Design an enzyme around this catalytic site. Structure first.
Site, PDB file in Angstrom:
ATOM      1  N   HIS A  64      11.025  46.172  22.398  1.00 36.58           N
ATOM      2  CA  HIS A  64      12.093  47.043  22.863  1.00 36.58           C
ATOM      3  C   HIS A  64      12.927  47.514  21.704  1.00 36.58           C
ATOM      4  O   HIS A  64      13.269  46.743  20.827  1.00 36.58           O
ATOM      5  CB  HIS A  64      12.954  46.262  23.839  1.00 36.58           C
ATOM      6  CG  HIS A  64      14.185  46.956  24.288  1.00 36.58           C
ATOM      7  ND1 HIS A  64      14.181  48.211  24.840  1.00 36.58           N
ATOM      8  CD2 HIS A  64      15.445  46.504  24.413  1.00 36.58           C
ATOM      9  CE1 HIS A  64      15.393  48.529  25.214  1.00 36.58           C
ATOM     10  NE2 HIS A  64      16.174  47.507  24.976  1.00 36.58           N
ATOM     11  N   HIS A  66      16.281  48.557  21.192  1.00 31.74           N
ATOM     12  CA  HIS A  66      17.453  48.276  21.995  1.00 31.74           C
ATOM     13  C   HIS A  66      18.519  49.351  21.795  1.00 31.74           C
ATOM     14  O   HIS A  66      19.052  49.462  20.690  1.00 31.74           O
ATOM     15  CB  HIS A  66      18.020  46.916  21.645  1.00 31.74           C
ATOM     16  CG  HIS A  66      19.186  46.549  22.483  1.00 31.74           C
ATOM     17  ND1 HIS A  66      19.190  45.464  23.338  1.00 31.74           N
ATOM     18  CD2 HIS A  66      20.384  47.155  22.614  1.00 31.74           C
ATOM     19  CE1 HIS A  66      20.366  45.416  23.935  1.00 31.74           C
ATOM     20  NE2 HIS A  66      21.094  46.443  23.537  1.00 31.74           N
ATOM     21  N   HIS A 109      13.356  44.163  19.176  1.00 36.22           N
ATOM     22  CA  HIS A 109      12.972  42.781  19.418  1.00 36.22           C
ATOM     23  C   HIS A 109      11.844  42.701  20.393  1.00 36.22           C
ATOM     24  O   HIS A 109      11.662  43.574  21.228  1.00 36.22           O
ATOM     25  CB  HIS A 109      14.183  41.934  19.923  1.00 36.22           C
ATOM     26  CG  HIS A 109      14.850  42.435  21.156  1.00 36.22           C
ATOM     27  ND1 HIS A 109      14.445  42.097  22.424  1.00 36.22           N
ATOM     28  CD2 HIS A 109      15.950  43.198  21.317  1.00 36.22           C
ATOM     29  CE1 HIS A 109      15.259  42.652  23.314  1.00 36.22           C
ATOM     30  NE2 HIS A 109      16.209  43.290  22.666  1.00 36.22           N
ATOM     31  N   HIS A 111      10.164  41.934  23.704  1.00 30.75           N
ATOM     32  CA  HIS A 111      10.628  41.938  25.074  1.00 30.75           C
ATOM     33  C   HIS A 111       9.530  41.336  25.973  1.00 30.75           C
ATOM     34  O   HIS A 111       9.340  41.769  27.081  1.00 30.75           O
ATOM     35  CB  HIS A 111      11.077  43.320  25.525  1.00 30.75           C
ATOM     36  CG  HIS A 111      12.229  43.279  26.483  1.00 30.75           C
ATOM     37  ND1 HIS A 111      12.182  42.589  27.653  1.00 30.75           N
ATOM     38  CD2 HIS A 111      13.461  43.816  26.419  1.00 30.75           C
ATOM     39  CE1 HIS A 111      13.347  42.684  28.269  1.00 30.75           C
ATOM     40  NE2 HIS A 111      14.143  43.444  27.554  1.00 30.75           N
ATOM     41  N   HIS A 395      27.790  35.670  30.684  1.00 28.29           N
ATOM     42  CA  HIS A 395      26.478  36.295  30.671  1.00 28.29           C
ATOM     43  C   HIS A 395      26.625  37.764  30.208  1.00 28.29           C
ATOM     44  O   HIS A 395      27.251  38.565  30.901  1.00 28.29           O
ATOM     45  CB  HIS A 395      25.888  36.272  32.066  1.00 28.29           C
ATOM     46  CG  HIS A 395      25.669  34.902  32.612  1.00 28.29           C
ATOM     47  ND1 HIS A 395      24.597  34.094  32.238  1.00 28.29           N
ATOM     48  CD2 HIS A 395      26.357  34.209  33.548  1.00 28.29           C
ATOM     49  CE1 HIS A 395      24.686  32.950  32.888  1.00 28.29           C
ATOM     50  NE2 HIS A 395      25.732  33.001  33.698  1.00 28.29           N
ATOM     51  N   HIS A 398      22.705  43.691  29.940  1.00 29.04           N
ATOM     52  CA  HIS A 398      22.213  44.876  29.278  1.00 29.04           C
ATOM     53  C   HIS A 398      21.507  45.773  30.300  1.00 29.04           C
ATOM     54  O   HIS A 398      20.658  45.305  31.050  1.00 29.04           O
ATOM     55  CB  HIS A 398      21.169  44.462  28.217  1.00 29.04           C
ATOM     56  CG  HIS A 398      20.522  45.595  27.516  1.00 29.04           C
ATOM     57  ND1 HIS A 398      19.192  45.615  27.141  1.00 29.04           N
ATOM     58  CD2 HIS A 398      21.035  46.784  27.130  1.00 29.04           C
ATOM     59  CE1 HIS A 398      18.936  46.755  26.524  1.00 29.04           C
ATOM     60  NE2 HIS A 398      20.031  47.491  26.528  1.00 29.04           N
ATOM     61  N   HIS A 400      19.063  48.978  30.358  1.00 30.03           N
ATOM     62  CA  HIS A 400      18.174  49.841  29.602  1.00 30.03           C
ATOM     63  C   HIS A 400      18.368  51.317  30.019  1.00 30.03           C
ATOM     64  O   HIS A 400      18.813  51.612  31.122  1.00 30.03           O
ATOM     65  CB  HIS A 400      16.743  49.429  29.829  1.00 30.03           C
ATOM     66  CG  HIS A 400      16.362  48.153  29.181  1.00 30.03           C
ATOM     67  ND1 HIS A 400      15.288  48.072  28.337  1.00 30.03           N
ATOM     68  CD2 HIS A 400      16.858  46.893  29.258  1.00 30.03           C
ATOM     69  CE1 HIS A 400      15.140  46.834  27.900  1.00 30.03           C
ATOM     70  NE2 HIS A 400      16.063  46.072  28.464  1.00 30.03           N
ATOM     71  N   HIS A 452      19.548  43.143  32.969  1.00 29.47           N
ATOM     72  CA  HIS A 452      19.403  41.713  32.920  1.00 29.47           C
ATOM     73  C   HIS A 452      20.378  41.081  31.969  1.00 29.47           C
ATOM     74  O   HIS A 452      20.950  41.721  31.109  1.00 29.47           O
ATOM     75  CB  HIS A 452      17.992  41.328  32.516  1.00 29.47           C
ATOM     76  CG  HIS A 452      17.619  41.779  31.154  1.00 29.47           C
ATOM     77  ND1 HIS A 452      17.853  41.038  30.015  1.00 29.47           N
ATOM     78  CD2 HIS A 452      17.107  42.946  30.725  1.00 29.47           C
ATOM     79  CE1 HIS A 452      17.447  41.712  28.955  1.00 29.47           C
ATOM     80  NE2 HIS A 452      16.946  42.858  29.371  1.00 29.47           N
ATOM     81  N   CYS A 453      20.557  39.793  32.136  1.00 33.86           N
ATOM     82  CA  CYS A 453      21.289  38.980  31.145  1.00 33.86           C
ATOM     83  C   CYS A 453      20.492  38.972  29.849  1.00 33.86           C
ATOM     84  O   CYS A 453      19.298  38.698  29.891  1.00 33.86           O
ATOM     85  CB  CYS A 453      21.503  37.560  31.660  1.00 33.86           C
ATOM     86  SG  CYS A 453      22.485  36.635  30.464  1.00 33.86           S
ATOM     87  N   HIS A 454      21.149  39.216  28.718  1.00 30.36           N
ATOM     88  CA  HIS A 454      20.475  39.248  27.441  1.00 30.36           C
ATOM     89  C   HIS A 454      20.438  37.868  26.764  1.00 30.36           C
ATOM     90  O   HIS A 454      19.978  37.743  25.655  1.00 30.36           O
ATOM     91  CB  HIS A 454      21.073  40.319  26.525  1.00 30.36           C
ATOM     92  CG  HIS A 454      20.076  40.973  25.603  1.00 30.36           C
ATOM     93  ND1 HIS A 454      19.367  40.283  24.658  1.00 30.36           N
ATOM     94  CD2 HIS A 454      19.631  42.250  25.528  1.00 30.36           C
ATOM     95  CE1 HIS A 454      18.552  41.102  24.022  1.00 30.36           C
ATOM     96  NE2 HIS A 454      18.707  42.323  24.492  1.00 30.36           N
ATOM     97  N   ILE A 455      20.882  36.814  27.445  1.00 32.21           N
ATOM     98  CA  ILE A 455      20.561  35.440  26.994  1.00 32.21           C
ATOM     99  C   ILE A 455      19.093  35.255  27.375  1.00 32.21           C
ATOM    100  O   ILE A 455      18.735  35.275  28.565  1.00 32.21           O
ATOM    101  CB  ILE A 455      21.492  34.401  27.618  1.00 32.21           C
ATOM    102  CG1 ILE A 455      22.910  34.646  27.133  1.00 32.21           C
ATOM    103  CG2 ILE A 455      20.954  33.002  27.340  1.00 32.21           C
ATOM    104  CD1 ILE A 455      24.002  33.860  27.828  1.00 32.21           C
ATOM    105  N   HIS A 458      17.869  32.947  29.926  1.00 34.35           N
ATOM    106  CA  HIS A 458      18.248  33.265  31.294  1.00 34.35           C
ATOM    107  C   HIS A 458      17.339  34.363  31.868  1.00 34.35           C
ATOM    108  O   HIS A 458      16.928  34.296  33.049  1.00 34.35           O
ATOM    109  CB  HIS A 458      19.695  33.699  31.347  1.00 34.35           C
ATOM    110  CG  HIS A 458      20.662  32.651  30.925  1.00 34.35           C
ATOM    111  ND1 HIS A 458      22.016  32.895  30.874  1.00 34.35           N
ATOM    112  CD2 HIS A 458      20.473  31.365  30.539  1.00 34.35           C
ATOM    113  CE1 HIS A 458      22.623  31.799  30.454  1.00 34.35           C
ATOM    114  NE2 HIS A 458      21.723  30.854  30.243  1.00 34.35           N
ATOM    115  N   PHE A 463      16.745  36.125  35.508  1.00 37.02           N
ATOM    116  CA  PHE A 463      18.068  36.772  35.678  1.00 37.02           C
ATOM    117  C   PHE A 463      18.040  38.265  35.355  1.00 37.02           C
ATOM    118  O   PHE A 463      18.604  38.732  34.385  1.00 37.02           O
ATOM    119  CB  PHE A 463      19.105  36.026  34.838  1.00 37.02           C
ATOM    120  CG  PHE A 463      20.512  36.011  35.374  1.00 37.02           C
ATOM    121  CD1 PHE A 463      20.835  36.285  36.682  1.00 37.02           C
ATOM    122  CD2 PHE A 463      21.535  35.628  34.541  1.00 37.02           C
ATOM    123  CE1 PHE A 463      22.107  36.165  37.135  1.00 37.02           C
ATOM    124  CE2 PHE A 463      22.849  35.547  34.988  1.00 37.02           C
ATOM    125  CZ  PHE A 463      23.114  35.797  36.291  1.00 37.02           C
TER     126      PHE A 463
HETATM  127 CU   LIG Z   1      22.941  34.645  31.181  1.00 30.92          CU
HETATM  128 CU   LIG Z   2      17.923  43.976  23.461  1.00 30.55          CU
HETATM  129 CU   LIG Z   3      15.912  44.129  28.271  1.00 28.95          CU
END
Ligand SMILES: [Cu+2]
Ligand SMILES: [Cu+2]
Ligand SMILES: [Cu+2]
Ligand SMILES: *[C@@H]1O[C@H](CO)[C@@H](O[C@@H]2O[C@H](CO)[C@@H](O[C@@H]3O[C@H](CO[C@H]4O[C@H](CO[C@H]5O[C@H](CO)[C@@H](O)[C@H](O)[C@@H]5O)[C@@H](O)[C@H](O[C@H]5O[C@H](CO)[C@@H](O)[C@H](O)[C@@H]5O)[C@@H]4O)[C@@H](O)[C@H](O[C@H]4O[C@H](CO)[C@@H](O)[C@H](O)[C@@H]4O)[C@@H]3O)[C@H](O)[C@H]2NC(C)=O)[C@H](O)[C@H]1NC(C)=O
Ligand SMILES: *[C@@H]1O[C@H](CO)[C@@H](O[C@@H]2O[C@H](CO)[C@@H](O[C@@H]3O[C@H](CO)[C@@H](O)[C@H](O)[C@@H]3O)[C@H](O)[C@H]2NC(C)=O)[C@H](O)[C@H]1NC(C)=O
Ligand SMILES: *[C@@H]1O[C@H](CO)[C@@H](O[C@@H]2O[C@H](CO)[C@@H](O)[C@H](O)[C@H]2NC(C)=O)[C@H](O)[C@H]1NC(C)=O
Ligand SMILES: *[C@@H]1O[C@H](CO)[C@@H](O)[C@H](O)[C@H]1NC(C)=O
Length: 499
Positions: A64, A66, A109, A111, A395, A398, A400, A452-455, A458, A463
C-alpha cells in the site's frame, strides 16, 4: 531516493538496527526501506519484485502506498484481498499510478497480514515545486525525512498476538534496546542558520510516539499530506501511520541535542539513550547529547490544526447533516476485534475482483457484514465512539482512497464544521474521555476502500471494514492491467507453505 520509476526488490535478510540481529523483510536490502520520491503530477511505476523465501514472514506480499487517492487505479492500492491478491514469490508486479492532485509526506508498507511489522515499510515523498510553504525553509531532501518505527526482536507471527510494546523505537532506522546500551544512534545533521523541513513519518505497527527535540520548537506545516496553517509546538504525539512536516530553525548553539520519540507503552523514557536520536549541528563533536528534556508547554492538539487553504467540510453543520451517516460500534473478545458485530476475515476473491465480477451490493459482496456500499457524489459521516469494549485504545483509524475532515477530535467535544484539519489517519481517543471521533468525506472516488485500525495487530484481528464506493462505476473507472488479473490465479496456485 528512488522513483518514480523504480524496482523495489523484497527479500528476507539479517538486520541489526539496535544491535540485535534478526531476520527481517527488507526493501532494496534495507529496513526501513529506501525513500521513494517524485513530484506532483508524476506517474509512478514501482515494480515490486518478490524474492522472499521465508514463509514465517510470508513469501507473498502486497504494498500500500499510504495516503494516495488512487483515483482510477484502485487495483494498485495494496490491501491484500481487498484490492488485489498478493504478489507471489518469484514474481514481480508493477504498481502504476498517478498522483495528480496531492503533495506531501506519505509512506509505503506491506498490506498483507502483519508483514510490515517484520520490516516492509518505508517513507514516500511527493514534492511540490510550487509548495506554498517553500519560503518557510531552506532544506528539504533525503536527509530531512525522519522515520519512526517500533522494532521487535521476535517476528510478528512468532510473538504474542498483541505485543505489549516494542523492544526498541527506531528513529531513521536505528535505536537502542535494553540488550545493547551502546548501539549506534541515528544522527540528523543540520547547519547552523538554515531552516529545515523535517518530514516526520510514523511507520509504527502499534505504539504512538511523543516526539520532541531538546532546545528546539517545531512549526507544523503539513498533516498527513494536507498543508496546514503554521502551528508552533514543542512536542508532537504522532500515531501509527500519521505524518507531519515541521520546520526546525537550526539557530541554537552548535551542539548535540537529543531527538526523543517516547512510545505510549513498552520501554518508555530514555535510560541509556533508548527512544532517542541525535540532532548534530555541523561542528559539534561526534558524541552523545547531554541536553535535558524540558516540559512540553505547547504540545500539539489536533483541534489547533487548520488547513492552509480554505477547505469546506462535506455536508451541513449539524450531527448527521450528510447524505449518509455510519456509526462504527467496536467489540473485542480477546483474540478478535469486531465492527458492528463483524470481525473482518479476508475473502478468497478480492473485493475489487468481486465487484469486477458483478457484485455491487452489500448483500452480494463478501465478507458478509463487513462491506458498506456508499452512494456516489455524497457526503459521508463516520463516527467511532470510544468504548471499553475495544481495548488497545487509542485506535488510529485509516480510511483508504480519501482525506477526511476531522469534525470531532479525540479529547474534544467540539464539532468543527468550519475549518477542521483534513487528514487520513485519526486517533479515535479513549473511553475514559467519552470520545466520539467523527469524520466526514465526499464519495468522489469509485472503488472498494479499506477502513481500519492501523495498529497492524488489531487489523490482523479483524478490526476493519470495507467502504464500497459507487460500485456500479468501479469497473469503468478502474481498468485493470493484465498483470493484476494474473495475481489471483498465481497466488491461488501456490502451495500454502509458499504463501
Ligand atoms: Cu486498534
Ligand atoms: Cu498505511
Ligand atoms: Cu489499510
Ligand atoms: C524465517 O523468519 C523467522 C522470523 O524472523 C525466523 O525465525 C527465527 O527462528 C529462530 C529459530 O526458532 C529463533 O531463534 C531464536 O533466536 C534467539 C535470538 O537470537 C539472537 O541472539 C543470539 C544470541 O546473541 C547473543 O550472543 C551473540 C554472541 O554469540 C552476541 O553477538 C549478541 O549480542 C548476544 O550477546 C544470536 O546468536 C542470534 O544471531 C544469530 O541469528 C540471527 C538471526 O536470528 C542471525 O542473523 C545471526 O547471523 C546469527 O546466526 C540472534 O541475534 C535465540 O536467543 C534463541 O535461542 C535460545 O532459544 C533456543 C530455542 O528456544 C534455545 O535452544 C537456545 O539455546 C537459546 O537459548 C533462538 O535461536 C528466532 O528468534 C526467530 N526470529 C525471529 C525474528 O523471531 C527464521 O529463522 C527465518 N528462517 C530462516 C531460514 O532464516
Ligand atoms: C520555544 O517556545 C517556548 C514557548 O513559547 C519558549 O519559551 C519561552 O521562552 C522564554 C525565554 O526565551 C521565556 O521567557 C523568559 O523567562 C525567563 C525566566 O522566567 C525570564 O528571565 C526572561 O526575561 C524571559 O521572560 C518564557 O517563559 C518561555 N515561555 C513559556 C515556557 O511558556 C521558548 O523560548 C522557545 N524556544 C526557542 C529555542 O525558541
Ligand atoms: C457518537 O456519535 C454518533 C453519530 O452522531 C451517535 O450515533 C447517533 O446516535 C443517535 C442517538 O443519539 C441516533 O439517533 C443516530 O441514528 C446515531 N447515528 C448513527 C448511527 O449514525 C452515537 O450514539 C455517539 N456515541 C457516543 C457513545 O457518544
Ligand atoms: C473470538 O471470536 C472469534 C471470531 O468470531 C473466534 O473465532 C474466537 O474463538 C474468539 N476468541 C475468544 C478468545 O473467545
Amino acid at each position: 531516493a528512488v522513483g518514480p520509476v523504480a524496482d523495489l526488490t523484497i527479500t528476507d535478510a539479517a538486520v541489526s538496527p539496535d544491535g540485535f540481529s534478526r531476520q527481517a523483510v527488507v526493501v532494496n536490502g534495507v529496513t526501513p526501506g529506501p525513500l521513494v520520491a517524485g513530484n506532483i503530477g508524476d506517474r509512478f511505476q514501482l515494480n515490486v519484485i518478490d524474492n522472499l523465501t521465508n514463509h514465517t514472514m510470508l513469501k507473498s506480499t502486497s504494498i500500500h502506498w499510504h495516503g494516495f487517492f488512487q483515483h482510477g487505479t484502485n487495483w494498485a492500492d495494496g490491501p491484500a484481498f481487498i484490492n488485489q491478491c498478493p504478489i507471489s514469490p518469484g514474481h514481480s508486479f508493477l504498481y502504476d499510478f498517478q498522483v495528480p492532485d496531492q503533495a506531501g509526506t506519505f509512506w509505503y508498507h506491506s498490506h498483507l497480514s502483519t508483514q510490515y511489522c517484520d520490516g516492509l515499510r518505508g517513507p514516500f515523498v511527493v514534492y511540490d515545486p510550487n509548495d506554498p510553504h517553500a519560503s518557510r525553509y531552506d532544506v528539504d531532501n533525503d536527509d530531512t525525512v525522519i522515520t519512526l518505527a517500533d522494532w521487535y526482536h521476535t517476528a510478528a507471527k512468532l510473538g504474542p498476538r498483541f505485543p505489549g510494546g516494542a523492544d526498541a523505537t527506531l528513529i531513521n532506522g536505528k535505536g537502542r534496546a535494553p540488550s545493547d546500551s551502546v548501539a549506534e544512534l541515528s544522527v540528523i545533521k543540520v547547519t547552523k542558520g538554515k531552516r529545515y523541513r523535517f518530514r516526520l513519518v510514523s511507520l509504527s505497527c502499534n505504539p504512538n510516539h511523543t516526539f520532541s527535540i531538546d532546545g528546539h520548537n517545531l512549526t507544523i506545516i503539513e498533516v498527513d499530506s494536507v498543508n496546514s496553517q503554521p502551528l508552533e509546538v514543542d512536542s508532537i504525539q504522532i500515531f501509527a501511520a500519521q505524518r507531519y512536516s515541521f520546520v526546525l530553525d537550526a539557530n541554537q548553539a552548535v551542539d548535540n541535542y537529543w531527538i526523543r520519540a517516547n512510545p505510549n507503552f513498552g520501554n518508555v523514557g530514555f535510560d541509556g539513550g533508548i527512544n532517542s536520536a541525535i540532532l548534530r549541528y555541523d561542528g559539534a563533536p561526534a558524541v552523545e547529547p547531554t541536553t535535558n528534556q524540558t516540559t512540553s508547554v505547547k504540545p500539539l492538539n489536533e483541534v489547533d490544526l487548520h488547513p492552509l487553504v480554505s477547505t469546506p467540510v462535506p455536508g451541513a453543520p449539524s450531527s448527521g447533516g450528510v447524505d449518509k451517516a455510519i456509526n462504527m460500534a467496536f467489540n473485542f473478545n480477546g483474540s478478535n476485534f469486531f465492527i458492528n458485530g463483524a470481525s473482518f476475515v479476508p475473502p478468497t476473491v478480492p473485493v475489487l475482483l468481486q465487484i469486477l465480477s458483478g457484485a455491487q451490493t452489500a448483500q452480494d459482496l463478501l465478507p458478509s457484514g463487513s462491506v458498506y456500499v456508499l452512494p456516489s457524489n455524497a457526503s459521508i459521516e463516520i463516527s467511532f465512539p470510544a468504548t471499553a469494549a475495544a481495548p488497545g485504545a487509542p485506535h488510529p483509524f485509516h480510511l483508504h482512497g480519501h482525506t477526511f475532515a476531522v469534525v470531532r477530535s479525540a479529547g474534544s467535544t467540539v464539532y468543527n464544521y468550519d475549518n477542521p484539519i483534513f487528514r487520513d489517519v485519526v486517533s479515535t481517543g479513549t473511553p475514559a474521555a467519552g470520545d466520539n471521533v467523527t469524520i466526514r468525506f465526499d464519495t468522489n472516488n469509485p472503488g472498494p476502500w479499506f477502513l481500519h485500525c492501523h495498529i497492524d495487530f488489531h487489523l490482523e484481528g479483524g478490526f476493519a471494514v470495507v467502504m464500497a464506493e459507487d460500485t456500479p462505476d468501479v469497473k469503468a473507472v478502474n481498468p485493470v492491467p493484465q498483470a493484476w488479473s494474473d495475481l489471483c490465479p498465481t497466488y491461488d496456485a501456490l502451495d500454502p507453505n509458499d504463501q
